[PDB]
């Protein structure tokens, strides 16, 4: 009836990440590689990370060519690292 | 009665003030995000565009906003990471 499923060790395909990174530095280009690992990595600055979050959710709202094996993994990622803002603050 | 009753996410306390401050301001910024559709979209949202900025508030509200009380973090974080699930099935 109900399937649980945890975020964290939740498989994300690779052209996913990539996808997420191209169209993120398309909108904020000095958003560089480096940055993006980092924030996968464990998210430093709440600016950043803000704006990380917002291109994942731009693409889940308003994307209508979002792959829809995309849609568990990319949720997964918003929900997971929205995390960070319990201690990460202005 | 609605002073006293505690309010949960995923089992953490969700102060009612806090849900009244992120009301407020989403309001403020989005004068058409009436008090019905926050709590429509409270119980179960049901347009991606109007949870985008549902969510884009409170984003704001932990990226931003300096003097947000200490212990409204926890919740608020909650509220994020479980209102952005809805996005699996819903779909622009």
Redesign the interface.
């Given at each position: 009836s109900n399937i649980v499923l945890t975020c964290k060790d939740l498989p994300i395909p690779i052209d996913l990440l990539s996808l997420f990174f191209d169209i993120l530095n398309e909108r904020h280009p000095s958003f560089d590689e480096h940055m993006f690992l980092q924030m996968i990595r464990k998210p430093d600055d709440?600016?950043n990370?803000?704006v990380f979050?917002?291109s994942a959710?731009?693409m889940?709202?308003?994307?209508?060519d979002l792959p829809?094996h995309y849609?568990?993994p990319?949720?997964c990622l918003?929900?997971?690292y929205?995390?960070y803002?319990?201690?990460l603050?202005?």
């Open positions: 709440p600016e990370l803000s979050l917002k959710i731009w889940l709202s308003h994307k209508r829809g849609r568990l990319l949720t918003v929900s997971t929205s995390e803002f319990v201690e603050k202005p």
